[PDB]
């Protein structure tokens, strides 16, 4: 598993910005977006894995993700509750 952050293609970020209400986009944005997304994903997954390990489990559940998001002040509905 190497070089997957390039998997987020430029059209994907373009669609994300269009949903975000962005009309004109600079070309040197996408790598910054990828870095920020990587930071966010790392922060969430760290706590998710911490929860999974404290339960002595080997698979990560969505419910662990729910707790991790809740502890970071980002509550998500519709994934088990």
């Amino acid at each position: 598993l190497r070089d997957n952050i390039q998997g987020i293609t430029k059209p994907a970020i373009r669609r994300l910005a269009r949903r975000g209400g962005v009309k004109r986009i600079s070309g040197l944005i996408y790598e910054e977006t990828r870095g920020v997304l990587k930071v966010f994903l790392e922060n969430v997954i760290r706590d998710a894995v911490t929860y999974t390990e404290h339960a002595k489990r080997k698979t990560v559940t969505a419910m662990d993700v729910v707790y991790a998001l809740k502890r970071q002040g980002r509550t998500l509905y519709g994934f088990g509750g």
Partner: protein, 93 residues
């Protein structure tokens, strides 16, 4: 095993207000999660209130105070009215 939820009561209320409106499963789970979250918020605030005042009981007064603290304006007022009405009805009957 068996898991419980608020699905039946949510469906009852939906038929009460919109008798001709269905609901998808995902949305239903969304309401379930929403109810759970509100429950946790009110319960935690009530527990903090009780601990601050050095009390052993969670009464309806603490619930009303937590509702006032956690709800914005008109929502808080209407919820307080509903809770007081329900408490009065239950006490009378």
């Amino acid at each position: 095993t068996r898991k419980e939820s608020y699905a039946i009561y949510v469906y009852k209320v939906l038929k009460q207000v919109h008798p001709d409106t269905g609901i998808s499963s995902k949305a239903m789970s969304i309401m379930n999660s929403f109810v759970n979250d509100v429950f946790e918020r009110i319960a935690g605030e009530a527990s903090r209130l009780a601990h601050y005042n050095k009390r052993s009981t969670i009464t309806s007064r603490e619930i009303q105070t937590a509702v006032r603290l956690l709800l914005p304006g008109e929502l808080a007022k209407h919820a307080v009215s509903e809770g007081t009405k329900a408490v009065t009805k239950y006490t009378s009957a």
